[PDB]
């Protein structure tokens, strides 16, 4: 949050970058710094006695301009401190234990006592119960409960099964159980967590082109105001005595867009902080803004419908087999399928049709996995001879044991093939019990996620490429308005370059290495933490929550940053009319007494109005530090309505809030009797 | 009287619209490099003789062409004005002009400024104002229309690297827009009473006995192309207020329509070249709202007028001081604000002899940049300078990459846009500061108090803004004034033309995005109000310190 009162003293120590070496990088406030030093030495000589006057006015102006600089650097340093706190929260302990390396890759091999900071590519390491992953990589065999709360915020014990859709691991996370091996993929210091910590600690923050263009407009505006307030001196010298240098410098610093000039770094440092707080590791603010400008979104069904391979069961159709006999077959299958995916099929069948006639205790079923030569179940302890295999597997079983197969199983396989799902057949005894329907279900709330995407006007294209009918069904109960059946990598590259060549911007959220070239060719690249390592370096940003629709949050924050900076610079520009109405009649009351009818605020004195303006200039910055931290509230509106809302809030805040601020500060000064 | 002003503004705008909309269909034809109906054979037998190659050239060669043509024009005009005694058509045998006045007049006439620091009928021969002044009155407008044609071609071309050919551009624009409409306007002025005779200065004995002397010459021929475009340098010292230039109210209406004809037709051509007339009517509304508001405040200020006249025993208090007789208070006020809105520089009423509130507004519409139909050719690109910033701010409020008419806008033209916007107030404020840190400039004062500083600010704004309209109290015949205004004129023309051409070259390469569902429509009342707010915000935030010590100070006196 804003002020935890933990590191505020440290960041206030870090405010002191007042030396010119660390200040010329922001010219719109280097002008403020030079003006502050100039009015400070004017105040010093003024109190010494080179020129006659009170010198308390000049001393107060010099102090308050230094105060404006100090709160600008305070905003920047507080944003940097929040970024450092986020980086230290994501730090964990990278080097926490010696690595259990093996000279030869095999479970139960020669152990090692090597430290966890020199492991190279292709290094195998054993992980036992109650351990922690040293460095990122992939598993080879085995797997158990792995918790990633200390890295990603997810305390769910996500398993790491060998191969398959997810087999990659990240270093620095707790391991709860035994039977984990890890093959190293990248060296320490090549991972994205360490890269994010390095770029936060380095704090270079190469500015986005939008940031550079906004800085260019701020520079143009401060050149304009500098020349106006500099040429104001001969015009005043023409009529009577000229306006003093202190008043000119204070008016200049008031006119300079000081608020956005101070919060320009914070808008973007808080952007990186909100990247890291949304479980996303982002490389560049240009990538963040391009992700905020996504119009076309791309996905695959391998990460949407129960993350693939865990499709549900639908009534198990069969010819000549009654529903109760099919339920008995489901029970006999529930007394089998010792694989994890097989047990998933078992529990889906049980929740489809619960049956409690016999269990694992009454029927002592042999718990054996499949055989690699035929994908066959080794269970034979029941009354019927049980086989769990595919079509070719069960044909080989027929000419291995039963002899000749009928055409009923062939036509049932044909019906299943034309209806979709998977052609895996459950067989007990010498008769088939029907091909199990294994149509998938769209897990989660991806329907309303796609509804939110369509409300935000982002195209959602779903690219897996199985067949046109099941892609149409997946679109129907998913929410994507189109898809791409019969998908190949060259077709993906052609489609993405056609979208990029039609005048639209795209984004990919792939996981595998096959679509990694297309994902890297995309100008916005979202990498999957559960996805492959090579695709993770091929990406631009990676989301650590294993959520395909994290891009909606990425669009939210990326648009929030641009909206915040544009709104703040418009507010800073719009305050200048009120700053004129406060300063100019007071600034020229000495030599143009006829101008004393312009201060419609009915301010007290010329020596008080300028102080009130500079105090308002400092206090608006320190009050808008929370607006720099937390961005402008995004609502899913159209362009015209959102521009109208931004105008009605912030442009109306300009020319009205400075009225109240200057009047209240002048009233407080008169009450305190300082002026 | 307020109702008379209301109908005056209304019918002037209706006649301007119905005369400018058909010119858009025909200026977009010139933009598209499509010959007008009935001149293809004349074009193909003309350009072969002239050596104008049909091949197109990029922004660098286009800009080099325009600047070389302007340098040649400046050299020819300078060496003609330094002579004019070795040259014919000098019936009164006028002497050769001084070097400083010749340089200032030459740069004023070539850089679309037309600022007269002299008396024309007693300083210039017939030949200068017939040939050398008139060719610059033609080619400055032609160069401005060529620059905006390059910008419009850059906006409408998808991914080409060329902006067309400048030589054929100015040739076609001049010979088929600027010449024949000038013939029509000139013959109308001969019909109504403006003279063009080439006769020697004919002395007249009046009915009383005081032998005066009348001036003659090619007055209406220069008048027609001085009104077409936005040139605004007259034959005499009282430019477009002498009865020999605009004798009556119908002539003055033709003056007004010729002032606003080319920028309004250019806006219509910009609307019709994209296939979306909303994109042009957006700019037309954004200009016209500011225009009519400023007309209203000027007429109200001049109707309030001089308060001392009622206390000095007069039947009314309208500021007839320094205003014509057959042109009313409202009519001369409208011509003042039209002149200083469209960068013309021809004044009916002497702008120096205005009420403070009615004299601040011409200064304001000059100093904000020539955006409200401002300048021939300049009236669109000076407004595009503010459009490319308003759409940037609007895209920042949306939270997307800022794009105008599909093409993305980035740093590589944000630098040029910022430079081209700030080059104008830099010149205005630096010149107004230099004119008061020297004895000269501060010593050419005619009126004391804040009105003198208002005079100096108006003069330097007119020099830097290519207007030419004058608070004529300032005696700018001094070499310091001539050199300062010459430098301001030169930089205020070619520090705006160059970055506009660079923006065009950077923009023509970028492929235009076709359409999207979520981009901000830059045609509606919201965008019109945003552009108007930008124009009234920056351009006033610059000069409120400058305007407070002059007209505001003497108004609150």
């Amino acid at each position: 949050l804003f002020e935890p009162t933990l590191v505020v003293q440290a960041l206030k120590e870090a405010v002191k970058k007042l030396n010119p070496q660390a200040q010329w990088r922001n010219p719109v406030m280097f002008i403020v710094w030079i003006g502050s030093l100039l009015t400070t030495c004017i105040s010093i000589a003024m109190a010494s006695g080179a020129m006659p006057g009170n010198a308390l006015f000049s001393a107060a102006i010099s102090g308050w301009l230094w105060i404006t600089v100090l709160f600008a650097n305070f905003a920047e340093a507080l944003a940097e401190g929040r970024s450092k706190a986020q980086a230290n929260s994501l730090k964990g302990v990278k080097k926490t234990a010696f690595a259990r390396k093996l000279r030869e890759p095999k479970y139960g091999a020669a152990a090692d006592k090597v430290p966890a900071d020199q492991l190279r590519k292709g290094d195998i390491v054993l992980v036992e119960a109650g351990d922690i992953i040293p460095c990122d990589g992939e598993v080879i065999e085995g797997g158990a409960s792995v918790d990633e709360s200390a890295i990603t915020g997810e305390s769910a014990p996500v398993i790491r099964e060998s191969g398959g859709d997810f087999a990659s691991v990240t270093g620095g996370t707790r391991i709860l159980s035994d039977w984990l091996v890890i093959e190293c993929s990248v060296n320490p210091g090549e991972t994205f967590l360490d890269r994010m910590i390095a770029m936060v600690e380095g704090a270079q923050r190469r500015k986005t082109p939008n940031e550079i263009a906004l800085t260019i407009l701020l520079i143009a505006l401060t050149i304009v105001f500098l020349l106006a307030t500099a040429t104001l001196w001969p015009f005043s010298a023409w009529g009577g005595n000229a306006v003093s240098v202190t008043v000119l410098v204070a008016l200049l610093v008031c006119l300079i867009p000081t608020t956005i000039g101070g919060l320009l770094s914070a808008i973007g440092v808080a952007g990186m902080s909100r990247m890291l707080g949304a479980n996303v590791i982002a490389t560049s603010g240009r990538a963040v803004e391009a992700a905020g400008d996504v119009d076309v979104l791309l996905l695959n069904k391998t990460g949407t419908i129960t993350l693939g391979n865990r499709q549900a069961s639908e009534f198990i159709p069969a010819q000549g087999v009654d529903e109760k006999t099919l339920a008995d077959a489901a029970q006999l299958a529930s007394l089998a399928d010792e694989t994890p995916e097989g047990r998933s099929i078992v529990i889906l069948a049980k929740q489809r049709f619960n049956l409690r006639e016999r269990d694992v205790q009454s029927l002592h079923a042999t718990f054996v996995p499949f055989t690699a030569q035929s994908r066959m179940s080794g269970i034979n302890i029941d009354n019927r001879m049980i086989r769990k295999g595919s079509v070719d597997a069960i044909r080989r079983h027929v000419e291995a044991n039963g002899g000749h197969f009928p055409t009923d199983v062939d036509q049932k396989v044909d019906q299943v093939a034309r209806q979709g799902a998977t052609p895996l057949v459950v067989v007990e005894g010498s008769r088939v019990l029907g091909v199990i329907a294994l149509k998938d279900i769209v897990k989660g709330g991806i329907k309303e996620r796609f509804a939110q995407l369509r409300k935000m006007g982002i195209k959602t294209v779903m690219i897996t490429g199985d067949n046109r009918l099941t892609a149409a069904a997946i679109a129907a109960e998913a929410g994507v308005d189109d898809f791409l059946a019969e998908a190949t990598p060259e077709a993906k590259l052609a489609l993405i370059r056609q979208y990029q060549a039609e005048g639209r911007l795209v984004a990919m959220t792939g996981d595998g290495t096959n679509d990694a070239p297309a994902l890297a060719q995309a100008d916005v690249a979202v990498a999957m933490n559960s996805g492959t390592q090579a695709a993770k370096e091929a990406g631009n940003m990676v989301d650590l929550d294993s959520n395909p629709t994290k891009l909606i949050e990425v669009v939210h924050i990326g648009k929030q940053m641009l909206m915040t900076r544009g709104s703040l610079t418009t507010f800073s520009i719009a305050n200048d009319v009120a700053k004129y109405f406060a300063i100019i009649p007071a600034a020229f009351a000495a030599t143009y007494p006829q101008l004393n009818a312009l201060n419609i605020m009915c301010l007290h004195s010329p020596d008080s109005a300028i102080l009130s303006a500079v105090i308002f200039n400092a206090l608006i910055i320190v009050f808008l530090i929370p607006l720099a931290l937390k961005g402008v509230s995004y609502k899913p509106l159209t362009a015209s309505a959102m521009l109208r809302r931004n105008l009605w809030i912030y442009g109306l805040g300009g020319l009205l809030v400075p009225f109240i601020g200057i009047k209240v500060i002048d009233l407080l000064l008169t009450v305190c009797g300082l002026v | 009287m307020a109702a008379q002003g209301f109908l005056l503004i209304a019918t002037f705008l209706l006649v301007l619209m119905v005369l400018a909309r058909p010119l858009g269909s025909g200026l977009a034809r010139l933009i598209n490099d499509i010959p007008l109906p009935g001149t293809t054979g004349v074009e193909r037998v003309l350009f072969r003789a002239l050596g104008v190659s049909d091949r197109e050239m990029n922004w660098k060669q286009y800009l080099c062409a325009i600047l070389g043509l302007n340098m040649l024009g400046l050299a020819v005009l300078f060496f003609m004005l330094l002579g004019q005694h070795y040259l014919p058509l000098n019936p009164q045998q006028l002497p050769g002009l001084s070097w400083d006045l010749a340089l200032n007049t030459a740069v004023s006439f070539v850089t679309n400024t037309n600022w007269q620091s002299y008396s024309g009928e007693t300083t210039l021969s017939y030949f200068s104002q017939m040939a050398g002044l008139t060719v610059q009155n033609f080619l400055s407008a032609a160069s401005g229309i060529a620059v905006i044609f390059a910008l419009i071609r850059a906006f409408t071309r998808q991914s080409m690297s060329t902006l067309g050919n400048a030589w054929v551009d100015l040739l076609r624009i001049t010979l088929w827009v600027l010449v024949p409409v000038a013939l029509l306007i000139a013959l109308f002025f001969i019909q109504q009473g403006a003279l063009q005779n080439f006769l020697p200065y004919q002395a007249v004995n009046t009915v009383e006995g005081a032998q005066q002397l009348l001036p003659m010459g090619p007055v209406a021929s220069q008048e027609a192309i001085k009104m077409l475009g936005t040139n605004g340098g007259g034959f005499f010292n009282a430019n477009s207020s002498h009865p020999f230039e605009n004798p009556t109210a119908l002539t003055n209406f033709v003056q007004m329509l010729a002032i606003f004809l080319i920028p309004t037709a250019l806006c219509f051509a910009f609307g019709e070249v994209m296939g979306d007339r909303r994109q042009g009517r957006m700019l037309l509304w954004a200009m016209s709202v500011i225009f009519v508001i400023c007309v209203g405040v000027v007429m109200w200020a001049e109707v309030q007028g001089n308060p001392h006249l009622l206390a000095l025993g007069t039947d009314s208090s309208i500021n007839m001081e320094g205003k014509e007789s057959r042109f009313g208070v409202l009519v001369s006020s409208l011509f003042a604000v039209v002149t200083t809105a469209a960068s013309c520089g021809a004044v009916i009423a002497m702008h120096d002899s205005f009420t403070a509130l009615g004299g601040m507004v011409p200064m304001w519409l000059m100093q904000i940049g020539e955006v409200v139909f401002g300048g021939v050719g300049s009236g669109l690109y000076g407004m595009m300078l503010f459009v490319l910033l308003a759409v940037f701010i609007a895209g920042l409020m949306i939270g997307r990459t800022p794009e105008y008419l599909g093409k993305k806008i980035d740093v590589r033209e944000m630098k040029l846009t910022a430079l081209a916007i700030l080059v104008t107030p830099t010149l205005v404020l630096m010149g107004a500061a230099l004119a008061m840190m020297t004895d000269a400039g501060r010593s050419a004062m005619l009126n004391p108090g804040p009105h003198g500083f208002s005079e100096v600010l108006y003069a330097v704004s007119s020099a830097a803004n290519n207007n030419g309209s004058a608070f004529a109290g300032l005696s700018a015949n001094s070499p310091f004034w001539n050199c300062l205004l010459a430098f301001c004129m030169f930089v205020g023309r070619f520090g705006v033309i160059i970055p506009v051409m660079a923006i065009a070259g950077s923009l023509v390469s970028k492929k235009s995005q076709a359409a999207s569902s979520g981009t901000l429509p830059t045609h509606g009342p919201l965008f019109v109000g945003l552009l108007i707010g930008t124009v009234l915000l920056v351009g006033a935030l610059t000069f409120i310190p400058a305007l407070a010590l002059g007209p505001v100070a003497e108004y609150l006196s």
Binding site: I31, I219, V245 | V411, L419
Partner: peptide, 27 residues
């Protein structure tokens, strides 16, 4: 004109040069 304002003019020109340099630069 006199002394004491030439340093102000020089410092204003120096600030303008630095600001134009920052405008052209993409630092």
């Amino acid at each position: 004109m006199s002394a004491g304002v030439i340093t102000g003019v020089l410092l204003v020109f120096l600030l303008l040069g630095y600001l134009v340099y920052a405008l052209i630069n993409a630092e």
